């Protein structure tokens, strides 16, 4: 099974439910949950920091993608692709890339379509571990992720 899909899907999801809901989930983890734990940590440290950092940035581009439905959520897979992925690799960019993700998962409960979050992670994963694999499996996986930022 491909277990680099299968882990960055829990990390993202994981996150983005818990930047919208305020609340944690308690489920364990499945495979690797050891270090996806400590991914998830790393990315509440430094992901809620990104949002504050660039929070004007992160407002212009909500308002400029002026999401409201389903269709428009299907939409950002395209921007995705435009923005991230036709660019230098480097983790920074992918802590943006979940950052920006878990920004828009809070808006998405501003406007009731909450159901939208997982379809959201899922579409945010399929950029990542789709068009970046090589990057990743060279810079070691979640495991490099979390050395990376290691305090
Ligand atoms: O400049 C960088 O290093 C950079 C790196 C990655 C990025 C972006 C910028 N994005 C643009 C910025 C401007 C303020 C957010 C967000 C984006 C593009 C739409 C989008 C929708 C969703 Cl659901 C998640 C992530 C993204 C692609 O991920």
């Given at each position: 099974s491909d277990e680099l899909y299968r882990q960055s899907l829990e990390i993202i999801s994981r996150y983005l439910r818990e930047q919208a809901t305020?609340?944690?989930?308690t489920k364990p983890m499945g495979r690797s949950g050891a270090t996806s734990r400590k991914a998830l940590e790393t990315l509440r440290r430094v992901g809620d920091g990104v949002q504050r950092n660039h929070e004007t940035a992160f407002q212009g581009m909500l308002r400029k993608l002026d999401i409201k439905n389903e269709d428009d959520v299907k939409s950002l897979s395209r921007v995705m692709i435009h923005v991230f992925s036709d660019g230098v690799t480097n983790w920074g960019r992918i802590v943006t890339l979940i950052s920006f993700g878990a920004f828009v998962a809070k808006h998405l409960k501003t406007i009731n379509q909450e159901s939208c979050i997982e379809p959201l992670a899922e579409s945010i994963t399929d950029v990542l571990v789709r068009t970046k694999r090589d990057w990743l499996v060279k810079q070691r996986g979640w495991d490099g992720f979390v050395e990376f930022f290691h305090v």
């Open positions: 305020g609340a944690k989930d």
